[PDB]
Paper text:
Three prime repair exonuclease 1 (TREX1) is a crucial enzyme in mammalian cells, consisting of an N-terminal nuclease domain and a C-terminal transmembrane domain. TREX1 acts as a 3′-to-5′ exonuclease in the cytoplasm and the nucleus, and has multiple roles in cells (1–3). TREX1 is a member of the DEDDh exonuclease family and adopts a general two-metal ion mechanism for catalysis similar to other members. Our results show that RNA and DNA/RNA hybrids are substrates of TREX1, although the activity of digestion is lower compared with that of processing ssDNA.
The structure of the mTREX1–uridine complex is determined for further elucidation of the role of 2′-OH, and the Kd of mTREX1 with various nucleosides and deoxynucleosides is measured using ITF. The residues involved in interacting with uridine and 2′-OH are identical to those in nucleotides. The structural alignment of uridine and UMP also reveals similar positions in the active site of mTREX1, with the main difference being that the general base His195 is closer to uridine. Structural analysis and critical affinity measurements show that the extra 2′-OH does not impair the release rate for various products such as nucleosides and nucleotides.
Residue numbers in the entry:
A (entry chain C): 10 to 166, 175 to 234
B (entry chain D): 10 to 168, 175 to 234
Write the structure that this text describes.
Amino acid sequence: HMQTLIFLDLEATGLPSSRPEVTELCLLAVHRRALENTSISQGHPPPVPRPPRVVDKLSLCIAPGKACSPGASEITGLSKAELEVQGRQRFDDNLAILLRAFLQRQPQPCCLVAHNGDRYDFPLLQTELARLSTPSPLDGTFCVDSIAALKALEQASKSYSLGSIYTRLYWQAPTDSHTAEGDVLTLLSICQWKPQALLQWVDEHARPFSTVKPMYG
Amino acid sequence: HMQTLIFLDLEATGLPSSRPEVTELCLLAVHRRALENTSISQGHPPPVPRPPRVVDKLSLCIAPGKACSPGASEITGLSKAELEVQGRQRFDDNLAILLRAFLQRQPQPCCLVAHNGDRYDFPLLQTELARLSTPSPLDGTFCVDSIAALKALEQASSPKSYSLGSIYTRLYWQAPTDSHTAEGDVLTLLSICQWKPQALLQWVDEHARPFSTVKPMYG
Ligand SMILES: O=c1ccn([C@@H]2O[C@H](CO)[C@@H](O)[C@H]2O)c(=O)[nH]1
Ligand SMILES: O=c1ccn([C@@H]2O[C@H](CO)[C@@H](O)[C@H]2O)c(=O)[nH]1
Ligand SMILES: [Mg+2]
Ligand SMILES: [Mg+2]
């Protein structure tokens, strides 16, 4: 039984072929009680659920070592030059120390939830952490891809991009697409669609983050 | 010249008389360039500005050592019982580590900005940090009270309540959202501080004082 779900989103300099680097990271830590007490979804469509009162949130912009592709910069609204002029620092040991302290405030066991995590966010995060001297702060942490989760939840009762799912469930467009915090809030909203069912799915398919292979070396 | 403004709000178990303890804390770190490149406020009323794209955010719920007053739990929507059952940790050394590493990512010098901060947020934070073995992570950090800031700005602008909501409604003709939540109040404060960013930064540089000179509320 996971006690904490940590909704995660990364934005980066480009697509996996590009050997991308992280430009923004958001973590939203929600205790399982706070999630499973999100009210049922009635109506077609139901209203967009309200986030739980009690949450822990960390959102950071990160200077990459290489430029964002024009396309990445258009959709994320971020660029290496603007990140550097505002003094953003690299993905370095102090950041790992920060994440470690943030994670240690969460009850265990703890599971990251990210949309397309299995093929982007998690392997990329593994790569950024591998470059550090610091031992990984995520080794004891679990992770799941919300795509597989929502596929299993919908067929228990067609695109699976974040926006497609949110639109299909609430008949509205998400807000603040491809911003780390905005995407995390959209994912939380989707996961509050059937919190108990999702939580049971997570408990069954969560896997240790230490088993995730890096995106590149 | 302050290079980073860190908008800060604390919620707690009650008023200073009751020797309160922190229950929620939000920091919103904004580089000075992101603030002064906010679109110039025009129109009457102007729209509530968008937050700058580039920000660092940290919001945390904290288990207090004492229960909240009836009123405090009502306005904040928090209670010691609910924070505990959701596993929230107390104001401890690990939190001080988190704060230290967060501040270290911001360009220096860095200034805290909190509404009524001189009479509540800053002295209470100093009291919480003083209970810890850890040397204060705020020793090299500055702080200002946005009440003084907004008063000074409106006195120069125009040769009356200064509560957060009264200012926000006067500037924008709408009520704030999510009052007495840590992140909600920080977002409200940022919006009123984006009213006149250049003049605000000028006032902050003139009046930023070391957090080390802040007297603890109690203890
Ligand atoms: O159409 C898209 C979607 C995503 N990405 C890259 O993938 C990252 C994660 O979504 C983005 O920040 C961006 O770098 C693109 O380049 N194009
Ligand atoms: O009417 C009020 C205003 C503030 N507070 C206390 O002051 C904190 C914010 O200043 C709140 O979280 C609460 O603890 C009250 O108890 N009552
Ligand atoms: Mg994503
Ligand atoms: Mg306040």
